[PDB]
């Protein structure tokens, strides 16, 4: 009977796991770490991701809502962060509004560790094998089933292998290799500086007009998001600075060590010196010492497909993205939903051949591949729009609004139900 191996207990892998559990599909999660750690990064999930969470199972969405914070007002105001008018005190200034982005079906943010902790409560402990660092995959000569080989020297068998193992996926290496020309994530030239302050502090400094909703402050070479989270009485400040430099290469198993460097507030101060009072004040609210996150994506070196034989990729393993149109983790949840649904059809059969397993994964890839590639490219472009890379969009508000509203519609307002039904229709025709 049909066994799914999930490699990696990140958001993608855990979401899939709950999906399979609720559909009575046999699986095991293989996780290299001793536990799921404590990475507390804020991830914003968009309406499409929330629908996918619910379709996986109500408890996946519940796990998220249990820990997520809604911003005070639900529209994102795009402003020109340079041409703020009226005063040098943000409390008395007028924001230079470009356009308002209304989200249909809500966005919320959570700490990654909080959501993981929630989802993990719905997965039996025996379904997770820790200290299982996937190193290679072979085919069983006798059975033709997949053979996972771990760094500890042990093996395991499965009918399908789902690489949910993140931006530096070993499953991806198994499928396509890891030479200099191989598919991989590379630096997107975007550096993130993040901080949380009391909402009362932000209001004191900026005035309640500027803390009453999310605001994305656009400008030359850099942008800031100020996101009021009234239910934890916090203001989240996120600054992204565009960096034409390459990112210093470090050889390390740790993504934190690979993608993060110490910084000072001065780097942000300098980056936003030509911006208006609101942005300068927001950046001033950072700690003096902080970290900078180098954002990597798979724009330049994508994978050619998400499936090959009995093996496939989901989440950051398949399509690590910039977060400029919401966290890529959300589209990992879409991936997990399609997989959960297709794998459940296979699990219902008494015997599943290698051929049929491979065809099923191919259907998953056909459904997700181009939409995923578009996420990576569109999110990159959104960052270029917000940092005025090729145009001063402060002078082209209506053109900017049409571009961002359209890209957001394509990404966020997707027919999640239709996606799954399409996958299953195609699967039914092909097997
Ligand atoms: C420092 C840092 C800051 C970030 N900040 C943001 C942010 O601000 N916003 C945002 O949207 N996203 C952010 N992210 C990314 C976010 O964490 C992921 O996009 C999200 O978790 C979805 O990734 P995933 O589930 O596909 O894979 P991951 O979260 O990478 O999970 C992969 C899992 O697989 C495991 N694994 C890896 N290789 C193997 C192997 N060979 N065998 C077994 N297990 C393996 C890992 O231990 C991990 O548990 C950040 C990431 C890092 C590292
Ligand atoms: C268009 C989308 C955005 O401008 C956008 C970007 C980020 C990073 C974010 O977190 C949110 C909620 C957003 O809406």
């Amino acid at each position: 009977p049909f066994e799914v191996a999930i490699v990696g207990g990140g958001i993608t892998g855990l979401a899939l796991a709950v999906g399979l559990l609720k559909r009575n599909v046999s699986f095991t999660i293989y996780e290299r770490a001793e536990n799921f750690g404590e990475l507390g990064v804020g991830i914003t999930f968009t309406p499409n991701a929330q629908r996918a969470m619910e379709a996986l199972d109500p408890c996946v969405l519940q796990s998220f809502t249990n820990v997520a914070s809604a911003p005070s007002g639900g529209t994102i105001n795009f402003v020109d962060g340079v041409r703020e008018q009226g005063s040098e005190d943000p409390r008395t200034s007028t924001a230079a509004l470009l356009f308002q982005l209304h989200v249909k079906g809500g966005y919320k943010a959570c700490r990654r560790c909080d959501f993981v902790d929630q989802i993990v409560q719905h997965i039996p402990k025996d379904c997770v094998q820790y200290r299982k660092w996937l190193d290679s995959i072979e085919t069983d000569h006798e059975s033709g089933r997949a053979v996972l080989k771990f760094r500890d020297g042990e093996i395991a068998h499965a009918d399908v292998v789902i690489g949910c193992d993140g931006i530096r996926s070993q499953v991806r290496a198994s499928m396509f290799g890891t030479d200099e020309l191989c598919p991989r994530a590379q630096y997107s030239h975007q550096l993130g500086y993040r901080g949380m302050v009391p909402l009362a502090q932000a209001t004191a400094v900026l005035g309640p007009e500027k803390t009453s909703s999310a605001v994305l402050h656009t400008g030359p070479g850099a942008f800031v998001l100020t996101i009021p989270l009234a239910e934890v009485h916090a203001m989240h400040i996120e600054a992204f600075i565009m960096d034409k430099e390459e990112w210093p290469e470090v050889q390390t198993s740790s993504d934190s060590k690979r993608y993060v460097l110490p910084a000072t507030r001065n780097e942000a101060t300098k980056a936003f010196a030509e911006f208006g009072p609101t942005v300068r004040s927001a950046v001033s609210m950072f700690p003096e010492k902080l970290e900078k996150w180098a954002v990597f994506d798979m724009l330049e070196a994508p994978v050619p497909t998400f499936a090959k034989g009995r093996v496939c990729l989901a989440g950051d393993a398949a399509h690590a993205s910039t977060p400029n149109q919401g966290g890529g983790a959300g589209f990992g949840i879409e991936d997990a939903l399609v997989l959960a649904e297709v794998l459940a059809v296979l699990a219902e059969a008494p015997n599943v051949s290698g051929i049929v397993a491979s065809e099923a994964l191919a259907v998953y890839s056909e459904v997700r591949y181009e939409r995923s590639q578009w996420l990576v490219r569109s999110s990159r472009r959104t960052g270029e729009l917000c940092t005025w890379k090729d145009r001063d969009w402060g002078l082209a508000a209506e053109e900017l609004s049409r571009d961002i509203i359209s890209r957001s519609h394509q990404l966020w307002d997707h027919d999640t139900a239709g996606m799954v039904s399409d996958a299953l229709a195609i699967l039914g025709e092909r097997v």
Side-chain angles (χ1 to χ4, degrees), residues 1-33 35-37 39-71 73-84 86-124 126-140 143-148 150-178 182-230 232-243 245-248 250-256 258-273 275-347 349-350 352-397 399-431:
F2 183 76
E3 164 71 359
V4 174
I6 304 174
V7 175
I11 290 168
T12 302
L14 296 172
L16 175 55
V18 175
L20 292 183
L21 187 70
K22 297 290 188 172
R23 288 171 181 73
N24 189 38
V25 179
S26 176
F27 71 95
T28 303
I29 304 169
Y30 300 103
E31 170 55 54
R32 67 173 170 190
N35 58 57
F36 290 134
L39 186 58
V41 294
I43 306 172
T44 304
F45 293 81
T46 56
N48 55 301
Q50 296 185 60
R51 290 193 293 278
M53 294 177 190
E54 170 80 355
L56 278 162
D57 194 80
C59 75
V60 175
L61 181 52
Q62 191 178 357
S63 289
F64 175 66
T65 54
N66 290 163
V67 293
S69 322
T75 288
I76 300 141
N77 291 359
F78 282 65
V79 304
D80 175 342
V82 169
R83 299 190 178 80
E84 187 182 355
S87 168
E88 172 63 17
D89 183 349
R91 294 180 306 219
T92 64
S93 74
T94 306
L97 179 68
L98 301 173
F99 66 101
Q100 293 194 294
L101 181 59
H102 308 119
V103 180
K104 187 166 53 179
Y107 73 99
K108 299 184 201 281
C110 70
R111 311 196 293 166
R112 187 191 178 276
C113 62
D114 283 346
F115 188 23
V116 164
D117 170 84
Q118 285 298 297
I119 307 160
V120 159
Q121 296 169 18
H122 297 279
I123 302 171
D126 289 347
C127 287
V128 181
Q129 295 195 21
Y130 300 97
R131 302 186 169 284
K132 291 288 178 189
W133 195 332
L134 178 72
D135 193 51
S136 65
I137 307 177
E138 308 173 28
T139 297
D140 186 84
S143 70
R145 296 177 67 230
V147 182
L148 295 87
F150 308 93
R151 284 195 190 193
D152 66 1
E154 301 289 315
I155 68 179
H157 300 261
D159 296 286
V160 288
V161 179
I162 323 299
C164 301
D165 51 336
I167 193 162
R168 284 186 304 162
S169 169
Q170 190 72 3
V171 177
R172 187 198 316 153
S174 189
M175 297 164 72
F176 305 115
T178 30
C182 288
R184 58 188 187 292
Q186 299 177 259
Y187 181 45
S188 68
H189 302 296
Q190 160 170 355
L191 276 173
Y193 303 71
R194 301 150 282 153
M196 280 278 211
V197 301
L199 189 49
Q201 176 187 353
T203 293
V205 165
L206 302 180
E209 300 72 20
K210 294 177 168 67
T211 66
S212 76
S213 80
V215 183
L216 192 153
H217 315 250
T218 65
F223 71 96
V224 182
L225 269 156
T226 58
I227 298 171
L229 298 170
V232 301
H233 313 291
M235 164 77 78
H236 186 248
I237 311 172
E238 190 150 28
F240 286 104
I241 305 183
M242 294 316 106
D243 177 31
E245 309 301 309
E246 292 309 326
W247 182 249
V250 311
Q251 187 56 63
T252 177
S253 311
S254 164
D255 289 3
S256 301
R258 182 73 170 86
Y259 299 122
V260 174
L261 233 33
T264 80
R265 182 178 61 215
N266 275 350
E267 305 179 23
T269 300
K270 292 178 185 167
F272 291 101
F275 286 58
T278 289
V279 163
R280 288 195 278 105
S281 296
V283 163
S284 83
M285 290 190 279
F286 284 146
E288 292 188 349
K289 296 292 190 164
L290 73 170
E291 291 188 309
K292 60 185 180 197
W293 170 46
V295 181
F296 276 52
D297 72 13
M298 295 176 68
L299 184 59
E300 295 294 20
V303 295
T305 181
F306 294 170
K308 189 167 153 178
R310 286 176 179 278
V311 180
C312 67
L313 307 172
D316 287 1
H319 50 63
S321 189
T322 64
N324 301 319
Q325 285 274 356
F331 308 77
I333 297 183
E334 295 180 353
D335 295 342
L337 174 59
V338 176
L339 279 166
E341 289 277 345
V342 164
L343 296 174
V345 175
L346 268 42
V352 171
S353 72
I355 281 68
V356 160
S358 306
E359 285 157 355
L361 296 190
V363 168
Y364 152 73
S365 183
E366 188 185 304
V367 169
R368 293 301 299 153
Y369 183 79
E370 295 296 348
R371 160 169 175 79
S372 293
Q373 296 306 325
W374 183 230
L375 166 68
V376 175
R377 171 164 308 263
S378 181
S379 61
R380 186 79 87 89
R381 177 67 184 151
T382 301
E384 300 177 350
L385 294 176
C386 293
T387 64
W388 297 6
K389 186 178 178 161
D390 38 61
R391 298 274 296 283
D392 181 338
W393 293 108
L395 301 185
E399 186 177 353
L400 176 68
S401 77
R402 293 189 168 149
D403 184 338
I404 292 180
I405 289 167
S406 167
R407 291 159 185 290
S408 296
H409 185 54
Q410 297 171 316
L411 293 179
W412 297 347
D413 297 345
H414 176 79
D415 184 5
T416 308
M419 168 179 70
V420 170
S421 197
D422 288 5
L424 300 178
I426 294 168
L427 183 65
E429 291 175 345
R430 291 192 193 172
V431 293

Tab-separated table of all heavy atoms in Angstrom, residues 317-348, unseen atoms left out:
chain	number	residue	atom	x	y	z
A	317	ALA	N	11.659	24.559	-2.277
A	317	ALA	CA	12.423	23.627	-3.103
A	317	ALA	C	12.106	23.803	-4.591
A	317	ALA	O	12.969	23.611	-5.429
A	317	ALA	CB	12.126	22.220	-2.673
A	318	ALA	N	10.844	24.088	-4.944
A	318	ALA	CA	10.390	24.182	-6.322
A	318	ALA	C	10.503	25.599	-6.876
A	318	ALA	O	10.814	25.763	-8.065
A	318	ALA	CB	8.962	23.724	-6.426
A	319	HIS	N	10.253	26.607	-6.035
A	319	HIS	CA	10.075	27.960	-6.564
A	319	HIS	C	10.320	29.040	-5.503
A	319	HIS	O	9.510	29.954	-5.389
A	319	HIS	CB	8.666	28.101	-7.142
A	319	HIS	CG	7.592	27.647	-6.241
A	319	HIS	ND1	7.360	28.272	-5.030
A	319	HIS	CD2	6.720	26.621	-6.325
A	319	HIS	CE1	6.373	27.635	-4.402
A	319	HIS	NE2	5.974	26.628	-5.174
A	320	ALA	N	11.439	28.972	-4.755
A	320	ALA	CA	11.758	30.020	-3.793
A	320	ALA	C	11.607	31.385	-4.470
A	320	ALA	O	12.144	31.599	-5.561
A	320	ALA	CB	13.167	29.859	-3.271
A	321	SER	N	10.847	32.257	-3.800
A	321	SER	CA	10.433	33.539	-4.337
A	321	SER	C	10.846	34.675	-3.401
A	321	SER	O	10.939	34.515	-2.183
A	321	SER	CB	8.942	33.583	-4.528
A	321	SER	OG	8.608	34.769	-5.235
A	322	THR	N	10.965	35.890	-3.947
A	322	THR	CA	10.937	37.062	-3.080
A	322	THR	C	9.564	37.146	-2.410
A	322	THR	O	8.606	36.575	-2.925
A	322	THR	CB	11.235	38.348	-3.841
A	322	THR	OG1	10.192	38.548	-4.793
A	322	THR	CG2	12.595	38.294	-4.488
A	323	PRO	N	9.442	37.828	-1.248
A	323	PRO	CA	8.165	37.964	-0.547
A	323	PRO	C	7.327	39.182	-0.932
A	323	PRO	O	6.419	39.522	-0.195
A	323	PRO	CB	8.635	38.072	0.912
A	323	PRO	CG	9.878	38.904	0.805
A	323	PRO	CD	10.571	38.344	-0.439
A	324	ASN	N	7.608	39.802	-2.093
A	324	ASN	CA	7.047	41.105	-2.417
A	324	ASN	C	5.562	41.018	-2.737
A	324	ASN	O	4.876	42.054	-2.762
A	324	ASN	CB	7.797	41.771	-3.551
A	324	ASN	CG	9.253	41.941	-3.197
A	324	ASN	OD1	9.566	42.297	-2.051
A	324	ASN	ND2	10.147	41.617	-4.112
A	325	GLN	N	5.055	39.808	-2.972
A	325	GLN	CA	3.602	39.614	-3.230
A	325	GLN	C	3.065	38.638	-2.186
A	325	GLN	O	2.117	37.913	-2.494
A	325	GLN	CB	3.325	39.106	-4.643
A	325	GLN	CG	3.481	40.165	-5.728
A	325	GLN	CD	2.232	40.988	-5.958
A	325	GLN	OE1	1.173	40.750	-5.365
A	325	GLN	NE2	2.349	41.986	-6.818
A	326	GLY	N	3.652	38.666	-1.003
A	326	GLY	CA	3.305	37.758	0.068
A	326	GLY	C	4.306	36.609	0.165
A	326	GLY	O	5.104	36.350	-0.727
A	327	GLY	N	4.292	35.934	1.303
A	327	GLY	CA	5.287	34.904	1.558
A	327	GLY	C	5.101	33.752	0.573
A	327	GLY	O	3.987	33.275	0.373
A	328	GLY	N	6.218	33.313	-0.001
A	328	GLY	CA	6.256	32.160	-0.889
A	328	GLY	C	5.682	30.912	-0.228
A	328	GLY	O	5.143	30.041	-0.917
A	329	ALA	N	5.750	30.876	1.109
A	329	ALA	CA	5.224	29.749	1.870
A	329	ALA	C	3.765	29.546	1.511
A	329	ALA	O	3.278	28.420	1.459
A	329	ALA	CB	5.374	29.989	3.365
A	330	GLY	N	3.045	30.640	1.256
A	330	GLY	CA	1.645	30.499	0.868
A	330	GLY	C	1.431	29.680	-0.412
A	330	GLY	O	0.469	28.910	-0.526
A	331	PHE	N	2.316	29.824	-1.402
A	331	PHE	CA	2.189	29.095	-2.653
A	331	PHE	C	2.708	27.678	-2.443
A	331	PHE	O	2.269	26.744	-3.113
A	331	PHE	CB	2.807	29.909	-3.801
A	331	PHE	CG	2.251	31.337	-3.836
A	331	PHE	CD1	2.705	32.299	-2.919
A	331	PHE	CD2	1.326	31.738	-4.805
A	331	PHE	CE1	2.229	33.613	-2.953
A	331	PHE	CE2	0.868	33.048	-4.844
A	331	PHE	CZ	1.315	33.989	-3.921
A	332	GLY	N	3.595	27.485	-1.461
A	332	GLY	CA	3.908	26.136	-1.012
A	332	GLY	C	2.673	25.410	-0.492
A	332	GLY	O	2.528	24.190	-0.707
A	333	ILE	N	1.792	26.144	0.203
A	333	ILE	CA	0.553	25.548	0.699
A	333	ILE	C	-0.354	25.170	-0.477
A	333	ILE	O	-1.019	24.132	-0.443
A	333	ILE	CB	-0.108	26.452	1.763
A	333	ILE	CG1	0.804	26.604	3.023
A	333	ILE	CG2	-1.491	25.929	2.144
A	333	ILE	CD1	0.200	27.427	4.141
A	334	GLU	N	-0.408	25.985	-1.545
A	334	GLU	CA	-1.126	25.593	-2.749
A	334	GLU	C	-0.561	24.295	-3.337
A	334	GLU	O	-1.292	23.427	-3.819
A	334	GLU	CB	-1.083	26.641	-3.851
A	334	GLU	CG	-1.788	27.917	-3.458
A	334	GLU	CD	-1.719	28.926	-4.593
A	334	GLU	OE1	-1.026	28.680	-5.620
A	334	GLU	OE2	-2.410	29.933	-4.465
A	335	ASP	N	0.770	24.200	-3.375
A	335	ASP	CA	1.405	23.012	-3.896
A	335	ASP	C	0.948	21.792	-3.099
A	335	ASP	O	0.605	20.744	-3.683
A	335	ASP	CB	2.907	23.125	-3.792
A	335	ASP	CG	3.553	24.208	-4.642
A	335	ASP	OD1	2.913	24.707	-5.615
A	335	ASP	OD2	4.693	24.572	-4.264
A	336	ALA	N	0.996	21.932	-1.768
A	336	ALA	CA	0.622	20.853	-0.858
A	336	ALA	C	-0.819	20.408	-1.091
A	336	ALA	O	-1.116	19.213	-0.991
A	336	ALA	CB	0.848	21.247	0.599
A	337	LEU	N	-1.721	21.361	-1.319
A	337	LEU	CA	-3.116	21.009	-1.577
A	337	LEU	C	-3.274	20.135	-2.823
A	337	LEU	O	-4.045	19.175	-2.850
A	337	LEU	CB	-3.909	22.306	-1.751
A	337	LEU	CG	-5.369	22.112	-2.176
A	337	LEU	CD1	-6.094	21.277	-1.176
A	337	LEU	CD2	-6.078	23.436	-2.305
A	338	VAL	N	-2.639	20.535	-3.931
A	338	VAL	CA	-2.737	19.756	-5.153
A	338	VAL	C	-2.159	18.360	-4.934
A	338	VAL	O	-2.769	17.357	-5.329
A	338	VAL	CB	-2.105	20.470	-6.367
A	338	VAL	CG1	-2.133	19.570	-7.600
A	338	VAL	CG2	-2.864	21.755	-6.660
A	339	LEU	N	-1.012	18.279	-4.250
A	339	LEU	CA	-0.424	16.985	-3.959
A	339	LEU	C	-1.347	16.140	-3.079
A	339	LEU	O	-1.479	14.930	-3.310
A	339	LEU	CB	0.933	17.185	-3.302
A	339	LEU	CG	2.055	17.483	-4.284
A	339	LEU	CD1	3.269	17.994	-3.552
A	339	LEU	CD2	2.370	16.200	-5.093
A	340	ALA	N	-1.870	16.740	-2.001
A	340	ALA	CA	-2.738	15.994	-1.092
A	340	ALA	C	-3.864	15.351	-1.887
A	340	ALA	O	-4.234	14.201	-1.632
A	340	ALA	CB	-3.296	16.888	-0.001
A	341	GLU	N	-4.486	16.132	-2.765
A	341	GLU	CA	-5.647	15.683	-3.539
A	341	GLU	C	-5.261	14.594	-4.539
A	341	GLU	O	-5.920	13.552	-4.624
A	341	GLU	CB	-6.305	16.909	-4.168
A	341	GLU	CG	-7.007	17.775	-3.133
A	341	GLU	CD	-8.396	17.297	-2.773
A	341	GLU	OE1	-8.912	16.455	-3.539
A	341	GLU	OE2	-8.977	17.809	-1.772
A	342	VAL	N	-4.134	14.758	-5.255
A	342	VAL	CA	-3.747	13.774	-6.257
A	342	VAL	C	-3.314	12.480	-5.581
A	342	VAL	O	-3.719	11.413	-6.021
A	342	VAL	CB	-2.619	14.339	-7.140
A	342	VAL	CG1	-1.895	13.258	-7.935
A	342	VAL	CG2	-3.126	15.436	-8.053
A	343	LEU	N	-2.512	12.588	-4.519
A	343	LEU	CA	-2.015	11.422	-3.813
A	343	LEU	C	-3.175	10.642	-3.184
A	343	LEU	O	-3.119	9.414	-3.125
A	343	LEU	CB	-0.954	11.840	-2.803
A	343	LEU	CG	0.307	12.444	-3.437
A	343	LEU	CD1	1.226	12.968	-2.367
A	343	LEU	CD2	1.026	11.443	-4.334
A	344	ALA	N	-4.232	11.327	-2.764
A	344	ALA	CA	-5.383	10.623	-2.193
A	344	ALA	C	-6.077	9.735	-3.222
A	344	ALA	O	-6.614	8.675	-2.860
A	344	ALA	CB	-6.359	11.607	-1.620
A	345	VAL	N	-6.112	10.179	-4.489
A	345	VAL	CA	-6.684	9.373	-5.560
A	345	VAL	C	-5.842	8.110	-5.727
A	345	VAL	O	-6.383	7.017	-5.828
A	345	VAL	CB	-6.840	10.170	-6.876
A	345	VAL	CG1	-7.335	9.322	-8.050
A	345	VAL	CG2	-7.797	11.322	-6.667
A	346	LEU	N	-4.515	8.243	-5.715
A	346	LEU	CA	-3.630	7.101	-5.874
A	346	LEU	C	-3.744	6.154	-4.691
A	346	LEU	O	-3.685	4.932	-4.860
A	346	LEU	CB	-2.185	7.538	-6.032
A	346	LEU	CG	-1.695	7.749	-7.464
A	346	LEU	CD1	-2.691	8.456	-8.377
A	346	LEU	CD2	-0.399	8.499	-7.338
A	347	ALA	N	-3.870	6.718	-3.496
A	347	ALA	CA	-3.923	5.901	-2.298
A	347	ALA	C	-5.167	5.010	-2.290
A	347	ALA	O	-5.208	4.035	-1.539
A	347	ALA	CB	-3.931	6.778	-1.097
A	348	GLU	N	-6.205	5.425	-3.025
A	348	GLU	CA	-7.484	4.714	-3.064
A	348	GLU	C	-7.377	3.454	-3.920
A	348	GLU	O	-8.178	2.534	-3.752
A	348	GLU	CB	-8.620	5.592	-3.599
